Amino acid sequence: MESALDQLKQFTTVVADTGDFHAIDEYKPQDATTNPSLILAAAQMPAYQELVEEAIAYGRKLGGSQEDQIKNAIDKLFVLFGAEILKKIPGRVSTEVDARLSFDKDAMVARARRLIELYKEAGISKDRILIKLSSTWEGIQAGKELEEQHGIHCNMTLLFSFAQAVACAEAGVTLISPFVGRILDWHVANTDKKSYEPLEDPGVKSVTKIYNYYKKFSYKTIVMGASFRNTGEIKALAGCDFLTISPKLLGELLQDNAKLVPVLSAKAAQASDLEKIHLDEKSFRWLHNEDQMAVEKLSDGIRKFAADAVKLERMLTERMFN
Amino acid sequence: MESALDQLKQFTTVVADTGDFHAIDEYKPQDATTNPSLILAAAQMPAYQELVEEAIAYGRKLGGSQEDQIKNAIDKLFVLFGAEILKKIPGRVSTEVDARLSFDKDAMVARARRLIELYKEAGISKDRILIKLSSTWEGIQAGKELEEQHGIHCNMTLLFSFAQAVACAEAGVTLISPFVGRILDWHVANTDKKSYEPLEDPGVKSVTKIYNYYKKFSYKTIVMGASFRNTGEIKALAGCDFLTISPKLLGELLQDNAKLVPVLSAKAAQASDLEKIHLDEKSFRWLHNEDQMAVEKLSDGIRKFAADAVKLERMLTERMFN
């Protein structure tokens, strides 16, 4: 159209990164994403206290130990936000399984089926859902199993290293969400270069590289850049399959109207010099370890989400067991 | 009275951390330790160029590609330093398998058997050798397998988290070498404190905790504190089974003669409050990830050693193939 946002929609499928579904439709996204940190934030908003009470009652109604109830309440809460979001958009929503299961393959699978079940009980088809999993080797294997054995589509997140990107591709997962701004954060905090040209942004380069690898070798996994610090990073990735953006940045993209030029494409990726590689667990863990930023961000990413999960549990138990 | 070193020898078995075996006997250690880093340093010393030429001659004979001949040369070089060290001491020497195999369980095992073989060809019994392995889950499993299936004794190194310490204990490895000063380095660089009291030193606390857990629950694995920044850390660990110290600090302990008080003791540990826990891979990786310092130091520790290995290979190929 004319705004940067509408222009971006010509080259990339825009996705809204938030749990605050009231602010969604203003940007008309295709899909939506949520994570432990977003649900937490939104769950504390006055406007959504109604969903929380319903989730609590669900816990209460299913009964069992208090743990069965906080788990089921939280699981339902996620599903509730999910369903509401779905009424506002035409595509899929991403619901993440607890980060504390990041290294437990079977737990992530079982928990994923559980979420898909809860959604099913609410009349929502799994085709509208993307289960978010931490991109650890086990999370990726959980993704593989979910896709191949249960037809459950996944959103591999907290993806930082090229190794992770590769393992996900071979695992044939539906979608990956490479974090861009957090890569910038690491380079800003550790290296001595605190600034980057949109195109030089480390995060943008990781996603650009991953995108070229995926397209050049015909992997059907969807590349969705995520977590952004500015709109320059977003514009430098125009052309990417998908880009999940925060309401704040979506709003900025809706405000300005400079000419937006596509940057990523199947033709440029085909001209890049990347060579195909195969990774078993050993090679994966090694190649991943060689990427310090990735090792440290994936690790801290898991702790932060887990913490958001712990904080959400606490407030809820305090709320339903005084 | 006596020197701090000789006093420490009453409560702890002293081990020399170095490849420079000429400076060893001055401190009369029980065991000795070496690593891909120390060997690198060692081989570049004029005094040991004789061992390098012998190692080179060995590798050319086995043949293969440049990388191959370089492998046998390096393997022999390690063994040669090992043998020389053994002539100077009554105990065991630690030889580490390439850090680049840290995530490859079967490679570490095969490579370990190989080193034990080379030593055997040199008339050295395996009872005199401790194969050093990175303390990753696979390295620990390699240790377990080596001990149980081949009677090969291991030195689990780059041990930082309590999880690692636990996994090693259940794996029944012969010895673990918890790094002390590198834990200090992490806390100095990341937290905002510059100096701690010997007893408050994070590194000292990690080893103290590990020691109490081992003794309290009767694990026979030997606890050997390693990598020290100062002698205060060493004195705060007096009583530990073993302590491998650099020639520099050994020299300082030999110069001062203040009264040294034992700090760690199995009986004290046994009469303490710590709960026994079991860790499978899942629990291990999770408990380990909860320790940021450990996650980052183990990870960087592997990259650094691997780099020392890469540098040693290069210098050698340039020397035997130009």
XYZ file of C-alpha atoms in Angstrom:
644
model
C 0.000 0.000 0.000
C 1.918 3.061 1.271
C 3.015 2.642 4.895
C 6.137 0.642 5.715
C 3.936 -2.027 7.293
C 1.686 -2.529 4.277
C 4.755 -2.474 2.041
C 6.403 -5.147 4.162
C 3.268 -7.241 3.741
C 4.071 -7.496 0.012
C 7.348 -9.300 0.655
C 6.741 -10.867 4.048
C 3.904 -12.343 6.075
C 3.519 -10.181 9.176
C 2.842 -11.797 12.561
C 1.986 -10.005 15.819
C 4.130 -10.816 18.861
C 1.871 -10.341 21.891
C -0.670 -11.732 24.337
C -2.563 -8.440 24.377
C -4.993 -9.481 21.627
C -7.043 -6.285 21.843
C -4.223 -4.374 20.142
C -3.930 -7.015 17.396
C -6.504 -6.376 14.669
C -5.241 -2.798 14.327
C -2.327 -4.250 12.351
C -4.217 -7.095 10.612
C -1.539 -9.808 11.012
C -1.688 -13.272 9.455
C -0.465 -15.186 12.534
C 0.251 -14.298 16.159
C 2.845 -15.420 18.669
C 2.959 -15.635 22.436
C 5.617 -16.914 24.832
C 5.907 -17.385 28.625
C 7.010 -13.798 29.091
C 4.104 -12.364 27.064
C 1.378 -14.465 28.681
C 2.719 -13.464 32.078
C 2.615 -9.773 31.185
C -0.885 -9.950 29.688
C -2.241 -12.223 32.453
C -1.540 -9.356 34.833
C -3.575 -6.892 32.754
C -6.944 -5.771 34.199
C -8.575 -6.236 30.805
C -7.861 -9.984 30.791
C -8.666 -10.886 34.393
C -11.776 -12.531 32.966
C -9.687 -15.175 31.166
C -7.706 -15.802 34.338
C -10.835 -16.550 36.385
C -12.002 -19.000 33.728
C -8.602 -20.688 33.738
C -8.680 -20.919 37.541
C -12.146 -22.487 37.479
C -10.879 -25.012 34.947
C -8.115 -25.962 37.320
C -10.645 -26.164 40.137
C -13.150 -28.139 38.067
C -10.716 -30.796 36.880
C -9.589 -31.214 40.479
C -6.713 -33.259 41.826
C -3.714 -32.013 43.772
C -2.973 -28.277 43.847
C -0.214 -28.949 41.338
C -2.665 -30.580 38.955
C -4.797 -27.466 39.325
C -2.046 -24.817 38.817
C -0.787 -26.751 35.779
C -4.234 -27.187 34.262
C -5.114 -23.588 35.108
C -1.985 -22.316 33.374
C -2.420 -24.700 30.454
C -5.998 -23.500 30.062
C -4.967 -19.869 30.460
C -2.551 -20.232 27.540
C -5.269 -21.930 25.488
C -7.761 -19.195 26.384
C -5.459 -16.420 25.219
C -4.797 -18.543 22.177
C -8.472 -18.907 21.295
C -9.138 -15.185 21.762
C -6.212 -14.337 19.530
C -7.511 -16.734 16.891
C -10.847 -14.863 16.705
C -8.839 -11.783 15.677
C -6.680 -13.352 13.015
C -6.954 -15.620 9.945
C -3.918 -17.758 10.676
C -2.161 -19.570 13.482
C -1.147 -18.740 17.023
C 1.957 -19.961 18.828
C 1.636 -21.431 22.315
C 4.852 -22.368 24.102
C 5.282 -25.383 26.369
C 6.955 -24.607 29.722
C 10.649 -23.747 29.302
C 11.476 -26.017 32.228
C 10.919 -28.979 29.888
C 13.576 -27.752 27.428
C 15.823 -30.758 28.060
C 13.052 -33.301 28.503
C 12.069 -34.590 25.078
C 9.164 -36.836 26.119
C 7.699 -34.242 28.457
C 7.576 -31.621 25.694
C 5.828 -34.081 23.379
C 3.224 -35.153 25.927
C 2.646 -31.575 27.025
C 2.286 -30.491 23.405
C -0.372 -33.127 22.708
C -2.079 -31.930 25.884
C -2.249 -28.335 24.641
C -3.574 -29.498 21.271
C -6.207 -31.455 23.183
C -7.304 -28.468 25.259
C -7.594 -26.438 22.072
C -9.615 -29.282 20.546
C -11.974 -29.205 23.508
C -12.522 -25.545 22.706
C -13.419 -26.341 19.100
C -10.075 -25.176 17.688
C -8.322 -27.360 15.085
C -4.594 -28.049 15.423
C -4.093 -26.528 11.977
C -4.508 -23.207 13.760
C -1.846 -23.988 16.326
C 1.922 -23.886 16.451
C 3.480 -25.354 19.583
C 6.605 -23.371 20.542
C 9.568 -25.401 21.801
C 12.989 -24.290 23.007
C 15.515 -25.090 20.292
C 17.675 -27.481 22.291
C 18.533 -30.794 20.671
C 15.722 -32.482 22.622
C 13.268 -29.707 21.815
C 14.077 -30.139 18.139
C 13.668 -33.892 18.436
C 10.382 -33.299 20.206
C 9.422 -31.127 17.255
C 10.396 -33.839 14.800
C 8.326 -36.429 16.671
C 5.316 -34.128 17.036
C 5.285 -33.397 13.303
C 5.895 -36.969 12.132
C 4.076 -39.040 14.723
C 1.198 -36.730 15.684
C 0.806 -34.238 12.879
C 1.297 -31.434 15.374
C 2.974 -28.342 13.943
C 5.800 -26.662 15.798
C 7.473 -23.311 16.205
C 11.109 -23.919 17.180
C 12.134 -20.859 19.174
C 15.148 -19.390 20.998
C 17.063 -20.337 17.844
C 20.456 -18.632 17.768
C 23.183 -20.754 16.201
C 23.465 -21.922 12.639
C 23.658 -25.459 14.034
C 20.191 -25.079 15.579
C 18.909 -23.770 12.251
C 20.361 -26.811 10.498
C 19.059 -29.397 12.971
C 15.590 -27.845 12.702
C 15.676 -27.996 8.922
C 16.564 -31.684 8.854
C 13.983 -32.304 11.571
C 11.442 -30.945 9.101
C 9.725 -28.705 11.640
C 6.993 -26.377 10.395
C 8.558 -23.123 11.541
C 11.587 -21.662 13.287
C 11.766 -18.307 15.026
C 15.371 -16.965 15.008
C 15.814 -14.179 17.572
C 17.345 -11.055 16.057
C 17.575 -8.378 18.754
C 18.915 -10.727 21.415
C 21.843 -11.459 19.136
C 22.397 -7.721 18.911
C 22.190 -7.494 22.711
C 24.923 -10.116 23.111
C 27.254 -8.409 20.619
C 26.541 -4.997 22.139
C 27.277 -6.233 25.659
C 30.268 -8.433 24.822
C 32.065 -7.121 21.732
C 33.057 -3.466 21.726
C 30.911 -2.541 18.709
C 27.700 -1.145 20.220
C 26.099 -0.211 16.885
C 25.379 -1.845 13.514
C 24.034 -0.854 10.060
C 20.689 -2.636 9.581
C 22.428 -4.961 7.128
C 25.408 -5.491 9.452
C 23.239 -6.235 12.495
C 24.497 -9.652 13.740
C 20.939 -10.762 14.280
C 19.939 -9.787 10.776
C 22.946 -11.679 9.406
C 22.130 -14.869 11.319
C 18.604 -14.845 9.897
C 19.798 -13.862 6.427
C 22.260 -16.755 6.435
C 19.650 -19.198 7.749
C 17.132 -18.034 5.146
C 19.574 -18.509 2.277
C 20.491 -21.968 3.519
C 16.828 -23.000 3.789
C 15.822 -21.705 0.366
C 18.977 -22.792 -1.441
C 18.441 -26.391 -0.335
C 14.671 -26.454 -0.596
C 13.749 -26.908 3.034
C 10.069 -26.169 3.505
C 10.514 -24.964 7.086
C 9.193 -21.452 7.538
C 11.751 -18.855 8.535
C 10.242 -16.294 10.897
C 12.535 -13.618 12.300
C 11.605 -12.695 15.870
C 12.421 -10.408 18.825
C 13.414 -7.048 17.364
C 15.097 -4.006 18.894
C 14.319 -1.634 16.008
C 12.631 -1.399 12.611
C 15.919 -1.215 10.752
C 16.464 -4.897 11.559
C 12.975 -5.608 10.267
C 13.481 -3.732 6.980
C 16.847 -5.448 6.496
C 14.926 -8.730 6.544
C 12.115 -7.713 4.196
C 11.520 -10.723 1.984
C 11.789 -13.257 4.813
C 8.884 -15.740 4.878
C 7.475 -14.346 8.132
C 8.392 -11.719 10.723
C 6.710 -11.564 14.114
C 6.787 -7.992 15.358
C 5.799 -6.352 18.630
C 2.795 -3.988 18.699
C 5.196 -1.121 19.396
C 7.289 -1.654 16.259
C 4.257 -2.569 14.161
C 2.942 0.859 15.133
C 6.171 2.509 13.995
C 6.035 0.652 10.668
C 2.483 1.895 10.280
C 3.578 5.480 10.947
C 6.414 5.871 8.410
C 6.191 5.398 4.641
C 9.695 5.443 3.197
C 10.298 3.194 0.198
C 10.883 -0.380 1.346
C 13.135 -2.604 -0.749
C 12.966 -6.425 -0.549
C 16.266 -7.899 0.647
C 15.813 -11.653 0.975
C 14.570 -13.866 -1.860
C 14.733 -17.384 -3.265
C 16.930 -16.074 -6.098
C 19.576 -14.389 -3.921
C 19.630 -17.404 -1.576
C 20.278 -19.583 -4.622
C 23.351 -17.519 -5.475
C 24.835 -17.594 -1.964
C 27.865 -19.860 -1.405
C 26.437 -22.067 1.366
C 27.149 -25.822 1.262
C 24.714 -28.473 2.488
C 25.615 -30.286 5.719
C 24.156 -33.059 7.862
C 24.184 -32.995 11.659
C 23.661 -35.859 14.072
C 23.578 -35.088 17.795
C 27.389 -35.056 18.178
C 28.087 -32.701 15.298
C 25.158 -30.552 16.316
C 26.267 -30.031 19.909
C 29.782 -29.324 18.713
C 28.869 -26.880 15.963
C 26.483 -25.176 18.380
C 29.102 -24.907 21.115
C 31.413 -23.149 18.676
C 28.889 -20.275 18.709
C 29.356 -18.604 22.098
C 26.582 -16.078 21.605
C 24.176 -18.898 20.758
C 25.279 -21.051 23.664
C 24.820 -18.189 26.110
C 21.584 -16.759 24.685
C 19.840 -20.095 24.299
C 20.863 -20.944 27.888
C 19.786 -17.619 29.349
C 16.666 -17.667 27.196
C 15.598 -20.927 28.816
C 16.227 -19.634 32.363
C 14.276 -16.416 31.728
C 11.229 -18.199 30.307
C 11.328 -20.776 33.087
C 11.405 -17.863 35.557
C 8.422 -16.207 33.886
C 6.703 -19.580 34.265
C 7.645 -19.833 37.931
C 6.373 -16.307 38.556
C 3.094 -17.059 36.803
C 2.593 -20.239 38.859
C 3.252 -18.453 42.152
C 0.832 -15.574 41.545
C -1.799 -18.083 40.493
C -1.450 -20.389 43.495
C -1.526 -17.298 45.722
C -4.714 -16.427 43.882
C -6.474 -19.776 44.054
C -5.115 -21.201 47.317
C -4.519 -17.966 49.233
C 57.847 -25.143 61.919
C 57.374 -25.871 58.232
C 56.453 -24.280 54.916
C 52.869 -23.832 53.793
C 53.444 -26.437 51.082
C 54.723 -29.143 53.416
C 51.926 -28.293 55.843
C 49.340 -28.627 53.102
C 50.815 -32.068 52.342
C 49.586 -33.198 55.758
C 45.949 -32.596 54.885
C 45.999 -32.836 51.103
C 47.818 -34.714 48.356
C 49.646 -32.125 46.258
C 49.726 -32.459 42.461
C 51.775 -30.350 40.033
C 49.894 -28.681 37.181
C 52.366 -28.410 34.301
C 54.004 -29.935 31.234
C 57.369 -28.442 32.195
C 58.516 -31.564 34.077
C 61.979 -30.172 34.810
C 60.477 -27.836 37.423
C 58.485 -30.697 38.996
C 60.669 -32.622 41.450
C 61.520 -29.360 43.239
C 58.062 -29.632 44.856
C 57.914 -33.443 45.186
C 54.269 -33.903 44.100
C 52.346 -37.176 44.233
C 50.652 -36.832 40.833
C 50.957 -34.422 37.911
C 48.456 -32.919 35.491
C 48.657 -31.641 31.936
C 46.094 -30.352 29.427
C 45.934 -29.410 25.688
C 46.962 -25.934 26.857
C 49.980 -26.815 29.033
C 51.307 -29.274 26.458
C 51.102 -26.529 23.844
C 53.181 -24.296 26.083
C 55.532 -27.190 26.885
C 56.265 -28.286 23.309
C 57.197 -24.713 22.329
C 59.980 -24.710 24.936
C 63.557 -25.124 23.614
C 64.304 -27.621 26.384
C 61.679 -30.085 25.103
C 62.270 -29.839 21.346
C 63.820 -33.293 21.690
C 60.450 -34.855 22.599
C 58.813 -33.085 19.671
C 61.254 -34.571 17.153
C 60.597 -38.040 18.548
C 56.841 -37.475 18.313
C 57.198 -36.274 14.717
C 59.240 -39.331 13.759
C 56.499 -41.467 15.285
C 53.677 -39.890 13.265
C 55.330 -40.067 9.839
C 55.685 -43.803 10.336
C 51.984 -44.487 10.799
C 51.230 -42.550 7.641
C 47.931 -41.291 6.283
C 46.910 -37.708 5.463
C 48.634 -34.662 6.930
C 45.918 -34.424 9.579
C 46.364 -38.161 10.288
C 50.156 -38.144 10.735
C 49.687 -35.084 12.876
C 47.280 -37.035 15.107
C 49.744 -39.794 15.921
C 52.519 -37.246 16.374
C 50.420 -35.264 18.825
C 49.164 -38.397 20.571
C 52.749 -39.558 20.958
C 53.897 -36.115 22.063
C 51.356 -36.171 24.913
C 52.478 -39.692 25.843
C 56.135 -38.651 25.748
C 55.582 -35.728 28.106
C 53.530 -38.117 30.199
C 56.305 -40.684 30.440
C 58.923 -38.079 31.337
C 56.688 -36.676 34.045
C 56.169 -40.177 35.447
C 59.950 -40.649 35.916
C 59.852 -37.621 38.248
C 56.884 -38.630 40.372
C 55.505 -41.609 42.323
C 51.934 -41.282 41.183
C 49.790 -40.687 38.140
C 49.803 -38.201 35.297
C 46.759 -36.775 33.533
C 46.631 -36.766 29.732
C 43.635 -35.104 28.121
C 41.910 -36.299 24.969
C 41.292 -33.570 22.368
C 38.637 -31.063 23.508
C 37.052 -31.255 20.055
C 35.651 -34.658 21.043
C 33.830 -33.223 24.080
C 30.404 -34.048 22.619
C 31.408 -37.300 20.961
C 31.136 -40.091 23.526
C 32.468 -42.966 21.394
C 35.358 -40.917 20.036
C 36.540 -40.040 23.540
C 36.432 -43.690 24.565
C 38.301 -44.951 21.504
C 40.835 -42.154 21.753
C 41.322 -42.878 25.446
C 42.025 -46.552 24.768
C 44.460 -45.401 22.104
C 46.404 -43.233 24.565
C 46.491 -46.081 27.098
C 47.873 -48.259 24.328
C 50.626 -45.820 23.392
C 51.609 -45.619 27.063
C 51.579 -49.420 27.169
C 53.917 -49.538 24.183
C 56.254 -47.368 26.242
C 56.143 -49.820 29.135
C 53.843 -47.641 31.263
C 50.925 -49.311 33.055
C 47.471 -47.702 32.926
C 47.447 -47.545 36.730
C 49.821 -44.613 36.265
C 47.474 -42.807 33.913
C 44.399 -40.646 34.267
C 42.667 -39.754 31.021
C 41.243 -36.218 31.230
C 37.805 -35.697 29.677
C 35.685 -32.551 29.375
C 32.842 -32.821 31.873
C 29.974 -32.721 29.395
C 27.283 -35.373 29.739
C 28.941 -37.446 26.991
C 32.405 -36.962 28.477
C 31.078 -38.210 31.806
C 29.425 -41.164 30.096
C 32.695 -41.837 28.309
C 34.332 -41.810 31.713
C 31.783 -44.249 33.079
C 32.321 -46.609 30.143
C 36.121 -46.374 30.316
C 36.130 -47.217 34.025
C 33.570 -50.026 33.873
C 34.262 -51.608 30.495
C 38.011 -51.066 30.145
C 39.353 -50.420 33.620
C 40.739 -47.098 32.407
C 40.857 -44.381 35.050
C 39.598 -40.905 34.281
C 40.058 -37.324 35.356
C 36.793 -35.465 34.647
C 37.822 -31.861 34.076
C 36.303 -28.439 33.299
C 33.837 -29.304 36.066
C 31.896 -26.218 37.144
C 28.307 -26.933 38.131
C 27.048 -28.997 41.010
C 25.148 -31.047 38.430
C 28.412 -32.048 36.755
C 29.826 -32.991 40.144
C 26.772 -35.153 40.800
C 26.739 -36.887 37.411
C 30.447 -37.684 37.850
C 29.861 -39.169 41.294
C 27.122 -41.504 40.067
C 29.257 -42.340 37.044
C 31.830 -43.610 39.517
C 34.753 -41.890 37.805
C 38.147 -42.054 39.512
C 38.732 -38.327 39.842
C 37.179 -34.944 39.118
C 39.032 -31.665 38.810
C 36.735 -28.721 39.730
C 38.148 -25.429 38.454
C 38.407 -22.797 41.190
C 39.949 -19.628 39.748
C 37.863 -19.691 36.559
C 34.758 -19.537 38.719
C 36.304 -16.501 40.381
C 37.017 -15.024 36.941
C 33.370 -15.380 35.927
C 32.053 -13.759 39.110
C 34.664 -11.004 38.900
C 33.778 -10.242 35.284
C 30.000 -10.594 35.590
C 28.872 -9.777 39.137
C 30.162 -6.453 40.487
C 32.488 -7.766 43.200
C 36.267 -7.655 42.607
C 37.659 -9.595 45.581
C 36.410 -12.231 48.032
C 37.634 -13.736 51.292
C 39.413 -17.041 50.663
C 36.432 -18.782 52.267
C 33.916 -16.716 50.278
C 35.668 -17.312 46.946
C 32.914 -18.746 44.679
C 35.345 -21.303 43.353
C 36.314 -22.406 46.828
C 32.647 -22.728 47.732
C 31.824 -24.864 44.696
C 34.610 -27.286 45.601
C 33.748 -27.182 49.293
C 30.139 -28.055 48.495
C 31.160 -30.799 46.074
C 33.594 -32.247 48.616
C 30.979 -32.370 51.364
C 28.472 -34.035 49.057
C 31.015 -36.682 47.993
C 32.169 -37.523 51.502
C 28.738 -37.323 53.113
C 27.378 -39.922 50.720
C 30.476 -42.086 50.507
C 31.403 -41.563 46.878
C 34.970 -42.741 46.311
C 35.617 -40.332 43.473
C 38.655 -38.232 44.237
C 38.031 -34.518 44.584
C 40.937 -32.506 43.154
C 40.621 -28.725 43.151
C 42.279 -27.203 40.092
C 43.157 -23.931 38.317
C 43.990 -21.392 41.023
C 44.389 -17.622 40.940
C 45.995 -17.305 44.386
C 47.143 -19.319 47.411
C 44.279 -18.094 49.567
C 41.924 -20.287 47.529
C 44.324 -23.167 48.035
C 44.538 -22.705 51.821
C 40.751 -22.374 52.030
C 40.596 -25.876 50.538
C 43.231 -27.510 52.759
C 41.863 -30.940 53.601
C 40.601 -31.634 50.081
C 41.675 -35.049 48.754
C 43.975 -33.545 46.123
C 44.909 -30.091 44.814
C 46.800 -29.625 41.585
C 48.786 -26.416 41.779
C 50.865 -24.491 39.256
C 54.651 -24.296 39.711
C 54.278 -20.587 40.421
C 51.883 -21.011 43.346
C 53.679 -24.118 44.602
C 56.730 -21.869 44.800
C 54.802 -19.309 46.839
C 53.529 -22.018 49.216
C 57.120 -23.164 49.639
C 58.228 -19.642 50.586
C 55.746 -18.711 53.284
C 55.280 -20.590 56.540
C 52.206 -19.215 58.284
C 50.154 -21.711 60.282
C 47.875 -23.672 57.957
C 44.554 -24.919 59.321
C 42.675 -27.836 57.700
C 39.251 -26.736 56.448
C 37.654 -29.695 54.681
C 37.213 -33.103 56.302
C 35.118 -36.130 55.446
C 33.853 -36.486 59.015
C 32.713 -32.846 59.013
C 30.981 -33.435 55.676
C 29.266 -36.622 56.884
C 27.853 -34.629 59.784
C 26.305 -31.967 57.553
C 22.975 -31.242 55.879
C 22.829 -32.145 52.204
C 20.340 -34.303 50.403
C 21.340 -37.083 48.069
C 19.972 -36.736 44.527
C 19.940 -38.820 41.354
C 20.376 -37.354 37.882
C 19.524 -38.887 34.533
C 20.429 -36.963 31.377
C 17.312 -34.758 31.495
C 17.696 -33.683 35.103
C 21.409 -33.235 34.626
C 21.143 -30.917 31.638
C 18.462 -28.924 33.402
C 20.238 -28.612 36.740
C 23.415 -27.697 34.856
C 21.672 -25.053 32.747
C 20.416 -23.403 35.911
C 24.077 -22.575 36.649
C 24.974 -19.788 34.209
C 28.598 -19.558 35.294
C 28.995 -23.290 34.747
C 27.234 -23.233 31.392
C 29.445 -20.427 30.146
C 32.734 -21.607 31.623
C 32.349 -25.209 30.523
C 31.440 -23.964 27.025
C 34.307 -21.494 26.783
C 36.654 -24.019 28.403
C 35.980 -26.451 25.560
C 36.531 -23.808 22.850
C 39.819 -22.667 24.414
C 41.260 -26.190 24.717
C 40.101 -27.045 21.197
C 41.880 -23.868 20.026
C 45.083 -24.845 21.822
C 44.730 -28.172 20.020
C 44.213 -26.484 16.659
C 47.261 -24.290 17.250
C 49.401 -27.261 18.202
C 48.321 -29.164 15.075
C 49.107 -26.235 12.778
C 52.541 -25.537 14.238
C 53.346 -29.264 13.845
C 52.138 -29.716 10.273
C 54.132 -26.607 9.380
C 57.054 -28.345 11.013
C 56.728 -31.770 9.391
C 55.172 -30.870 6.037
C 55.810 -27.116 5.769
